Design a protein around this ligand. Structure first.
Ligand SMILES: CC(=O)N[C@@H]1[C@@H](O[C@H]2O[C@H](CO)[C@H](O[C@H]3O[C@H](CO[C@@H]4O[C@@H](C)[C@H](O)[C@@H](O)[C@H]4O)[C@@H](O)[C@H](O)[C@H]3O)[C@H](O[C@@H]3O[C@H](CO)[C@@H](O)[C@H](O)[C@H]3NC(C)=O)[C@H]2O)[C@H](O)[C@@H](CO[C@H]2O[C@H](CO)[C@@H](O)[C@H](O)[C@H]2O)O[C@@H]1O
Ligand SMILES: CC(=O)N[C@@H]1[C@@H](O[C@H]2O[C@H](CO)[C@H](O[C@H]3O[C@H](CO[C@@H]4O[C@@H](C)[C@H](O)[C@@H](O)[C@H]4O)[C@@H](O)[C@H](O)[C@H]3O)[C@H](O[C@@H]3O[C@H](CO)[C@@H](O)[C@H](O)[C@H]3NC(C)=O)[C@H]2O)[C@H](O)[C@@H](CO[C@H]2O[C@H](CO)[C@@H](O)[C@H](O)[C@H]2O)O[C@@H]1O
Ligand SMILES: CC(=O)N[C@@H]1[C@@H](O[C@H]2O[C@H](CO)[C@H](O[C@H]3O[C@H](CO[C@@H]4O[C@@H](C)[C@H](O)[C@@H](O)[C@H]4O)[C@@H](O)[C@H](O)[C@H]3O)[C@H](O[C@@H]3O[C@H](CO)[C@@H](O)[C@H](O)[C@H]3NC(C)=O)[C@H]2O)[C@H](O)[C@@H](CO[C@H]2O[C@H](CO)[C@@H](O)[C@H](O)[C@H]2O)O[C@@H]1O
Ligand code: NA
Ligand code: NA
Ligand code: NA
Ligand code: NA
Ligand code: NA
Ligand code: NA
Ligand code: NA
Ligand code: NA
Ligand code: NA
Lengths: 596, 596, 596
């Protein structure tokens, strides 16, 4: 009996009944203790003696034994205890070896990480994926991971080790073909990794989430090829209320916070600092196996960001046998800025980027039904490479309403690069254009329409302050076709502008182009006393349907017409009034209109 | 002593002091074990022997005993253990019997559901409410439920059983007259039920919430009369970050995700697929006892939905002695689509529906001060029955700003049905109208104003692409009165339209109607050389205050006026210019304006 | 052995192995029990006998001993047990004494509050701060608090005691110089306090959050000087999904829900009732030590509020050696109302307030790049003191897009008070002005521009119903300079208004002022048959660049011009048509335009 009690079965001989309640189960202490489980229950030598964790102990095999055992009972939650750091010092074996895996996750087995998990220097200059939910080296032959949650106040620390080679991959949690899996509360820090968390695999998975996590300093070297903190690769999944921070120079050029790569995915309520990019919103044809060829219902909302490159990047692409499509996207309520940097010192600053594929192709995309609304964007005045939208690949539609954009360009694409085919670009008059870059725009077009063609598009320019440095508010080169479009420039703050809208190929003459913009025009009247015609001296107004005065008349003896039409020879003409006769000659600011 | 130790009081004789700290309490093992409690502590036969759960064991009485006992000590949290399925196989007794209750919840007693709870086939074809917080068969004589939280990674499974009769009710959690109650984390699945969760009772309750829950496949038969997944019937309560999915055909016709039925309630950040409806936002007079006759401060924001009928349904109604009012509503940031379906195959597709009462009355409602802003809506091109708003009952105000609506109709109501009285309908120019339904609109009016009357309303139509199939952009039948309103049609993409705005009762002539829209007009001049008048051949322009040219002048020898007014006989008239004399006859596209 | 077993070391002699697994650690019961810790482990007399909590027991020393001990082991989570109320009855000692501290928090030591914590009457009429994370009386010499989380279903009750003197301070949780600290789930109630929670100290701290907490009735007396429920004084921190309620009259005059006082801070998804104010968004120079002199990336989104004063208050100020700046702010998606009250009975109602500093100075502020978008605001018709913006101090920019404001004023500042210098105030046409206050505006200007100067501003007024009671839609006194601005009044619902826009100093004549608004003008023609001029009888139109008819022509024999320009003497002039000759005299409603 003494022997039984001191034995490992002792607690199984000590009776217990909850709160002395006579209606409660007559149990043994061991039954109640068996209701919970921790790493300490597996962190022992072959004789069953507990092993203290530390920098010289590899905890991997013990944590794997705990997970495997709990898995065998239909699941539960293993605690990783507070007040200790648990080092990992070797790779795992079996199915996860193909993924450079350390720990293998299993279905229904949750991890409550309250202490710290820290990679030992065995992993320096090596690939690794700390937690892996695949059960096979080939993800295509992998089983699923279901009902696996990682949560707590603890920490995953990547030991500060740099990558050994750019081709290597490193990850924190790869859930795999993951259904109802989540990470909540955890801080991931101090590394050089590719991703912190990945959700799903090529569309297989569902209901995976990352909530209230922190990601701190996860890129640190020039070796690191690329980094996206959370890659969402299964539908009905997302990231909310997270914090992302980088301090490395390299992060400003390579790091993105989130990738939304399947339908019905979201990125909300998060704060980003020190990253190149905010989010990719993409349908890769190569990733279309699990959930189809369409990324739709994509939501980026209510985030706060300081970045160095582009906030949201839109794209879709193709393989030999699959074509990716991106549609039904909303980007709203975000407040974003380009951090303090030299012009051209990081990838081109943008709120929205329509990005060419990984091979640089701009003629594979199928991006449409995007709404960008109620966001703020700001870039410091020196950052020439800042745009509301860098439209660098084919676009089948994007709508901008009620944003506030305060940067160098509104619409931009580099000339002599790609020549995008643009459809259904809508820029509503309710987009407010800020003045931070006023006086910086010598030689530049606010809306620089460097495309192959534009159709079914609306650009309603409204200034809110003067910028007389700019070459034009909007310019179309002669190589850009323009049809079935509406282009207007409001006259406010434009009286002293030489050029307002510029159509280098006279594209505003098109049958279904509807335009209006201010221009200065010289007119000369006949000498007749009374009602008298005034005609423009130049003949380039054959496209104008009406025009009206934007200038006061300093004269007593006559007045020019208030309104004008045109004539077949391209003159404007209207009827004014000579109180006394005489040939008149005036220079007037007019609002030129065509079909509006 | 051996006997004491092996007895149920044994743990109460084994001393313990935390971490051997001499300043800590000298306790017994049983005291520490008594800090927590699980179902295992009550899941026992009359001799105190533990009973294993399973499909042949009814766990109800044991779980009730646990709840009752914990309640007696001022509360706590009972764990429903992971790795087991706990079947429920009988109804409860007492107060919850009137609600077909299984388990009775009690104040301060939380349930941490980590395992699975599953209904046994005793419940097939029967009503049931799994967890009930009422303590009396008559909710009016019920006490309150306070401080009751249900949370964890577990599951409530409704066993797949169909309803027996349409008149039956089924629910997961009925909190009752519920104050500071919540459900977090739980998956509700595999049923045919009326609701999964209900919060409050006829306005009694407060601070009830449903967060990070999943609701999967909860309608499965033609017997089911109706389904709303969460019914919010107490103020200061809401639903956030939930997932809702249905696969049944019947769900596309009967199921709604959320009902917000009292003031200061919200539905946010959620994803919906396979449902008929997104949310009801309603003040039922019959439900006004607990929190007054007004539903105000109602918020539907940042949701993602694929539905088959209507996204938000607005309503209010009356009883013999109470009148319901709905006001101060915001609908923002939502991205919604009608899923792939045949036209007319499910209830009429809509972003907003102003719905008649349960008896079909359209003259009881008092709905006003609604803001719909920054949402996206899409319906596939074949779905004739798709509208931004189906305005089917009296409306005292609704404001639309900066949305993107891509469907068949903008404003719709069926002719020869209800004749709503409309006030303060505001459709701002910043609403972008998509082109998916271009070419599908033969015989149809984009804004089909099938009302009794319209007052104090604004409709600013702006197209962003051509649709020459439509009969008109906006049409008022002669039975619709129109007064103190502004109606405009921007000219862009309208040059080839026969009809733009149509006023079948010539209602645009009204003293306080402010309109503008394009029209083609034939004019004929006098023969006089010089300044010469042009007059319209038709006499239907007595209401026009000015008009201006939207056409170029192909002539050298003359020009028509740029601008026109009218004359008492209903002609337009303006002054053009004959370089050489002669009677002129032209057909010109004009922008007709009245008081704008 | 019997003796050992009954001793405090007994559990350390009883063997245990998890679930009888031969691969598990051979432990003792005490090891498993040592995995968790509660207040009961420290709530004991000097002989180690447990003490029951209650109104006559001071639990403070015991809870401090628990925290100190857990801190010594590298942290963990102490449970404050459910089913008991734990009273605090004395002040703490050491570093927190300077802060009137009760309990001292320590790094990595979390509190899981499931029971109730309640202040005893020792604290009546006294200052107190219940939980304090500073370790020194002087916050400047304090160490940090890291990784401290307070969570659970429990309650902190302040005992209902009033303040003794207005100069006293009271707080719930002062995290101090706080990094990765949070409060989740807790209800704070029944007090008269200054704050419930404060985060950070003068910019020192990071990643502090308050989530899913309730704050109920925390002001109760006329003695209380001021109250803000959560004060956020460190960056990368915020408040989400909280509930705030007050019932006291005094709260309607003194209480604010949140203060956002450092960069990258947020307030989201919360509900407020009974408060004076929603949120301060402020950069105090005096608080600039820890995180710099700029508050930027400030976010107030998706809140629901009933308040009595101002929803968001913007400000910045200076000290002898530091200047505060506020920029890059977003206010979106909020639905707010002024609760039922008499006019002038609480501080002036406002959605946005640009507030002078604590000394009343209006010439210290540097507030710019603010976006206010997609919000709703409502005040009952009797509340004269209600404005979309009360602009009472210097403003360097604020942008309003796509809001719905239904109150007395749109833009307001009291005349004969402060004279703000205003730059970059942008009021887009997409702001919808409600009609609740129609007919209440005798003697009042909808936009009452009571400033020193206005520059680089846009005000686009659009009515949606008639209000003929108002004196004007917009008025500039002669003391307000106006330059490089755009001011328009849409004609809809304005035909019967005497005054639309009023420029008491004729400021619309300015070279870079762009305006348009309706006016009635009397004209007289020459007698000539045919094309004939009409001239205004008054000479105050020297600033007008064009005008056009907003009136029908009731005549057959002639028509006035459709469009007009001006003449140097300030007449308008245009060319109409006399079918028969004769001098004509008409009164016409025109749209007057200047440079637009
Ligand atoms: C770091 C990052 O996320 N970058 C984005 C680009 O992603 C792509 O490059 C990545 C570089 O790391 C990834 O490729 C790498 O990893 C692949 C997967 O690893 C294998 O399979 C795993 C399941 C195993 O555990 C591993 O052991 C290994 O076997 C590997 O095949 C590639 O060779 C390697 O370079 C990334 O690949 C994806 O990763 C996720 C997450 O782990 C996984 O779920 C997917 O299965 C996998 N996809 C594929 C196809 O294998 C790869 O996608 C990304 O392409 C780019 C988006 O922008 C560009 O394209 C847009 C659309 O055309 C265009 O709009 C834009 O302008 C372009 O810049 O963004 C980041 O750069
Ligand atoms: C399924 C659903 O939610 N449908 C919505 C309509 O709700 C209404 O019909 C429901 C059908 O199930 C409910 O009625 C049923 O249940 C009633 C309540 O059950 C009793 O009381 C419970 C507390 C007990 O536990 C039960 O044992 C039982 O005793 C019952 O009285 C009815 O006879 C039965 O048909 C629903 O009733 C409400 O349910 C909630 C949640 O449980 C409860 O808190 C309320 O007390 C209770 N209300 C009432 C009045 O009893 C009943 O409301 C809903 O009316 C409709 C809204 O849209 C229509 O009306 C709008 C406003 O005029 C209009 O804009 C719109 O166009 C219309 O379609 O939406 C769903 O159909
Ligand atoms: C109640 C509230 O929050 N009111 C807002 C104003 O805040 C300011 O007044 C408060 C009155 O309580 C605070 O001052 C009081 O407390 C100070 C701090 O206490 C000391 O230091 C603590 C760390 C210790 O634990 C204490 O023991 C004590 O030693 C004290 O120095 C003052 O004497 C006392 O009156 C508040 O002070 C701040 O509090 C936070 C939170 O605890 C702390 O992190 C800060 O260190 C501390 N700040 C300073 C400078 O010490 C003090 O800021 C607030 O000023 C006002 C904002 O609006 C006005 O100014 C705007 C900007 O110009 C302008 O736009 C607007 O129109 C103005 O009305 O809002 C509330 O009234
Ligand atoms: Na691999
Ligand atoms: Na769109
Ligand atoms: Na081209
Ligand atoms: Na009943
Ligand atoms: Na409204
Ligand atoms: Na009628
Ligand atoms: Na102090
Ligand atoms: Na702004
Ligand atoms: Na002045």
């Amino acid at each position: 009996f003494r022997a039984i009690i001191e034995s490992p079965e002792g607690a199984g001989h000590v009776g217990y009944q909850y709160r002395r309640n006579t209606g409660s189960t007559m149990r043994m202490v061991s039954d109640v203790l068996d209701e919970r489980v921790s790493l300490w229950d597996f962190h022992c030598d072959p004789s069953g003696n507990v092993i203290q964790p530390g920098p010289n102990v590899d905890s991997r095999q013990y944590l794997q034994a705990a997970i495997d055992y709990v898995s065998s009972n239909g699941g539960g939650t293993i605690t990783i205890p507070a007040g200790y750091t648990w080092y990992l010092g070797s790779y795992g074996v079996g199915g996860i070896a193909g993924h450079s895996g350390i720990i293998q996750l299993r279905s229904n087995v949750n991890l409550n990480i309250e202490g710290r998990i820290h990679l030992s220097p065995f992993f320096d200059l090596k690939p690794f994926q700390v937690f892996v939910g695949f059960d096979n080296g080939d993800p295509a032959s992998s089983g699923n991971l279901e009902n696996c949650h990682i949560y707590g106040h603890g920490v995953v620390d990547f030991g500060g080790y740099e990558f050994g080679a750019s081709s290597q991959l490193r990850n924190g949690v790869a859930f795999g073909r993951s259904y109802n899996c989540s990470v909540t509360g955890i801080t991931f820090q101090n590394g050089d990794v590719t991703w912190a968390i990945t959700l799903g695999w090529n569309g297989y998975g569902s209901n995976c989430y990352v909530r209230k996590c922190r990601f701190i300093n996860l890129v640190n070297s020039s070796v690191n090829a690329a980094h996206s903190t959370v890659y969402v690769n299964c539908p009905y999944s997302g990231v909310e209320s997270c914090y992302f921070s980088m301090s490395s120079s390299f992060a400003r050029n390579i790091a993105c916070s989130v990738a939304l790569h399947q339908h019905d995915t979201f990125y909300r309520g998060s704060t980003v600092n020190g990253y190149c990019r905010g989010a990719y919103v993409v349908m890769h044809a190569a990733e279309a196996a699990g959930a189809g060829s369409y990324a739709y219902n994509m939501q980026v909302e209510n985030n706060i960001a300081v970045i160095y490159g582009q906030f949201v990047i839109l794209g879709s692409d193709v393989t030999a046998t699959v074509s990716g499509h991106l549609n039904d996207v909303i980007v709203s309520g975000n407040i974003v800025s380009i951090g303090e940097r030299a012009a051209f010192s990081a990838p081109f600053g943008a709120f929205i980027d329509i990005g060419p594929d990984n091979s640089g192709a701009s003629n594979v995309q199928d991006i449409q039904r995007v709404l960008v609304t109620g966001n703020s964007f700001y870039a410091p005045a020196n950052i020439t490479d800042s745009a509301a939208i860098t439209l660098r690949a084919n676009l089948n539609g994007c709508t901008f309403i009620a944003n506030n954009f305060d940067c160098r360009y509104m619409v931009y694409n580099a000339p002599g690069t790609t020549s995008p085919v643009v459809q259904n670009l809508v820029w509503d008059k309710s987009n407010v254009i800020g003045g931070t870059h006023a006086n910086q725009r010598a030689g530049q077009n606010l809306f620089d329409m460097q495309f192959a063609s534009v159709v079914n598009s609306t650009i309603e320019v409204q200034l809110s302050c003067e910028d007389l440095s700019m070459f034009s508010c909007i310019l179309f080169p002669a190589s850009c076709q323009l049809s079935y479009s509406k282009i207007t420039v409001d006259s406010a703050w434009t009286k002293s502008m030489s050029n307002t809208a510029v159509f280098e190929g006279n594209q505003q003459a098109g049958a279904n182009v509807y335009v209006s913009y201010p221009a200065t025009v010289n007119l000369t009247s006949y000498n007749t006393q009374g009602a008298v015609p005034f005609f423009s001296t130049d003949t380039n107004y054959a496209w104008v349907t009406s025009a009206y005065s934007l200038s006061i008349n300093e004269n007593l003896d006559f007045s020019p017409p208030a309104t004008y039409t045109n004539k077949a020879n391209g003159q404007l003409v209207g009827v004014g009034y000579n109180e006394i006769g005489g040939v008149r000659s005036v220079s007037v600011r007019l609002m030129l209109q065509r079909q509006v």
